[PDB]
Amino acid sequence: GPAGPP
Amino acid sequence: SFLTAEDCFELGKVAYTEADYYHTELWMEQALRQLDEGEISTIDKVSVLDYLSYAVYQQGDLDKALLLTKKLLELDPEHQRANGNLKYFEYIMAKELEHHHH
Ligand SMILES: [Mg+2]
């Protein structure tokens, strides 16, 4: 699954 | 009193941290629009697109999220998460086309 900034 | 591109980006990060992904998009795109009009500023587009692509994904706009990830990867080909995001989107897209071939 996609990962955004923390 | 008014908002610089830096301000817009900071407001976009406030929106993002509250999972306001539409407002994230509005502020981040406004940051980019101020840059494109020749506003002098020190923010980096790579970071802007990182938030923006994730926010657009949250809205279910997969095509536009992919677009933005590719724009990020043109500016920073190293970028670890964008590279992972790209692989994800390409996987999904490869799956769609696999389905239509069956
Ligand atoms: Mg909170």
Numbering used by the authors:
A (entry chain E): 3 to 8
B (entry chain A): 143 to 244
Question: Mind quoting what the paper says about this structure?
Answer:
The α‐subunit provides the N‐terminal dimerization domain, the middle peptide‐substrate–binding (PSB) domain, and the C‐terminal catalytic (CAT) domain. There are three isoforms of the α‐subunit, complexed with a β‐subunit that is protein disulfide isomerase, forming C‐P4H I‐III.
An extended mode of binding of proline‐rich peptides (PPII, polyproline type‐II, conformation) to the PSB‐I domain has previously been reported for the PPG‐PPG‐PPG and P9 peptides. Crystal structures now show that peptides with the motif PxGP (PPG‐PRG‐PPG, PPG‐PAG‐PPG) (where x, at Y‐position 5, is not a proline) bind to the PSB‐I domain differently, more deeply, in the peptide‐binding groove. The latter mode of binding has previously been reported for structures of the PSB‐II domain complexed with these PxGP‐peptides. Calorimetric binding studies show that the affinities of these peptides are lower for PSB‐I than for PSB‐II, with, respectively, K D values of about 70 μM for PSB‐I and 20 μM for PSB‐II.
